[PDB]
Amino acid sequence: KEQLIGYWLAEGLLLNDSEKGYQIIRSLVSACLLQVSGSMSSKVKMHHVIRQLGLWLVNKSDTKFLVQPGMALDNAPSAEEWNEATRISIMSNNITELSFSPKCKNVTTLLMQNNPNLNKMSYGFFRTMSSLKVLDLSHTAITSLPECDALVALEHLNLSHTHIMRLPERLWLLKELRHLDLSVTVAFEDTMNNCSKLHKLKVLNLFRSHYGIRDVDNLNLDSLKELLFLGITIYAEDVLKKLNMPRPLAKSTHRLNLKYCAEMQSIKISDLSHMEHLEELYVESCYDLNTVVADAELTTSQLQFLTLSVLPSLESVLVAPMSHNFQYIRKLIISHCPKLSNITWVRRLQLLERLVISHCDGVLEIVEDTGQSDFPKLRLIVLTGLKKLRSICKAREFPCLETLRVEDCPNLRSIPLSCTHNYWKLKQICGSVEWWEKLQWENRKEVACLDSKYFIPI
């Protein structure tokens, strides 16, 4: 829903209110035009018959569409078909090169995501695109974006998972731009001091970026007072300290990234307590990280996504047992933390669903040795390469468990799975056969039923 509501907001169909987008999605699903489908309710889908009906309505409508998604197209259609349509979508294709320059005056929206083979575009491609409002180049292998100074109405950009190297200066000429998404940019090197040129921006994103705000010098977002959501990747403590003064800019960091951090041996949510909008936290490759502090101070912010990556020096995280900010946590991912040896506090997460762990060779158990199961909403646990994981946790009720995958865990002898729990929501279980045989079970029915109904050997 977040993507679709974003495009609706950029298209002008919504009066700068996302909740009306949620309401429209509700009207569609209640009319059975769309159906919610996914691990969480945040994902919906369109039925095949309804999709064909929509295409037929497009054909009968004056506003022609040129939409070819997911048919593995290796050669983009000629400019003749583009010149008359209004909305174009070529996502999930295998387009390699784009040479023609369209004459599309009436076209307002483009969708060219999920194109691994798309890396180069013809210059002057954007000259005729005066009416463009929504533009996406995500999940592609391009390196530069051609001249786009003729885009007098663009509002949305999304270059997530794109190997963009430098943002052209033509963007600062666009005063109508509203949304920028530049996450998972591994080749990005352009400075962000030039973003102060634009005035009417609402959203940025530097989450999990190769280049972010490494120092206070790069922090110049105070000019953009129109911002409501920002993505920032920290590389030094001074950025966090400069972010730690009361202003609307500080509280707008909804999701935070830590990459190649220097002098970040400790982090406290009290230092993050100035942020009332923080949910997601990502930490990757920080040498300093020794300890993480989760204070009992119940900040209004409701953290839900935590991911810790490549922290050989991270020893432990202190979580208050009685009351903690992690009670809202939806998902945990811990990767490459050989020195992390205190995670028992996971049992205090009543709202935890998804778990992914890889090569954290310091964790004995996710839970070592209210009147309810600690993980009633648990859905997914992933373990990989855990050399020192003796066990997962004690036996607990997981009525909503659906998927479990564990590989390369020689010390993992027992799992909290037991036949005393009801089994009607489980659908698949993954893992190696040798580890399944090496597991110690309290009841043999836990072996036969799982191995005959939902176990998927690798």
Partner 1 sequence: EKGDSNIIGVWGQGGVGKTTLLHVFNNDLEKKAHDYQVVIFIEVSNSEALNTVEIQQTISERLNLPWNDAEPIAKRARFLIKALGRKRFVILLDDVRKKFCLEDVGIPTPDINSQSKLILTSRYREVCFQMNAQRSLIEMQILGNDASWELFLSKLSTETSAAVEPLGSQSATREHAMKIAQSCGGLPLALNVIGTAVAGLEEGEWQSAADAIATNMDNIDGVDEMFGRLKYSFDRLTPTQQQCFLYCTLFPEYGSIS
Which residues of this protein are in contact with partner 1, per CB under 8 A?
17-20, 22-23, 26-27, 29-32, 40-42, 47, 302, 370
Closer CB to partner 1, residue 41 or residue 440?
41
Closer CB to partner 1, residue 22 or residue 56?
22
Structure tokens at 96: 């390699």
Asked whether the beta carbons of 82 and 88 are under 8 A apart, the reply is yes
Shortest Å, Cβ 370 to partner 1: 7
Shortest Å, Cβ 25 to partner 1: 9
Shortest Å, Cβ 267 to partner 1: 26
* Cα–Cα nearest to 311, from 343, 346, 335: 335
Shortest Å, Cβ 301 to partner 1: 12
Asked whether the beta carbons of 209 and 185 are under 8 A apart, the reply is yes
Asked whether the beta carbons of 2 and 125 are under 8 A apart, the reply is no
3-state secondary structure (DSSP) of residue 267? strand
Shortest Å, Cβ 281 to partner 1: 20
Would you say the C-alpha torsion 297, 303, 306, 311 has a positive or negative sign?
negative
Closer CB to partner 1, residue 31 or residue 245?
31
Closer CB to partner 1, residue 3 or residue 27?
27
Would you say the C-alpha torsion 369, 375, 376, 382 has a positive or negative sign?
negative
The CB-side HSE value for 65 (13 A sphere, CA atoms) comes to 16
Based on DSSP, count helices (H) and strands (E) in the chain, helices before strands: 7, 23
- DSSP codes of every residue in 55-117: HHHHHHSSS-EEE--SS--SSPPPHHHHTT-SEEE--SS---EE------SS--EEE--SBTT
Closer CB to partner 1, residue 20 or residue 170?
20
Closer CB to partner 1, residue 32 or residue 245?
32
Closer CB to partner 1, residue 50 or residue 382?
50
Closer CB to partner 1, residue 128 or residue 304?
304
3-state secondary structure (DSSP) of residue 159? coil
Closer CB to partner 1, residue 351 or residue 419?
351
Would you say the C-alpha torsion 68, 71, 72, 73 has a positive or negative sign?
negative
Closer CB to partner 1, residue 50 or residue 262?
50
Shortest Å, Cβ 208 to partner 1: 24
Shortest Å, Cβ 157 to partner 1: 24
Closer CB to partner 1, residue 41 or residue 59?
41
Shortest Å, Cβ 330 to partner 1: 11
What gap in Å lies between CA 162 and CA 231, rounded to an integer?
Answer: 16
Shortest Å, Cβ 274 to partner 1: 21
- DSSP codes of every residue in 326-362: GGG--EEEEES-TT----GGGGG-TT--EEEEES-TT
Shortest Å, Cβ 402 to partner 1: 18
**∠ CA 314-317-319, rounded to 5°:** 175
Structure tokens at 121: 């575009």
By DSSP bridging, strand 34-36 and strand 44-46 are antiparallel
Distances (CA, A) of 20 to 8, 17, 127, 200, 278: 10, 6, 33, 22, 23
- 315 CB neighbour count, 10 Å cutoff: 15
Shortest Å, Cβ 431 to partner 1: 28
Asked whether the beta carbons of 115 and 137 are under 8 A apart, the reply is no
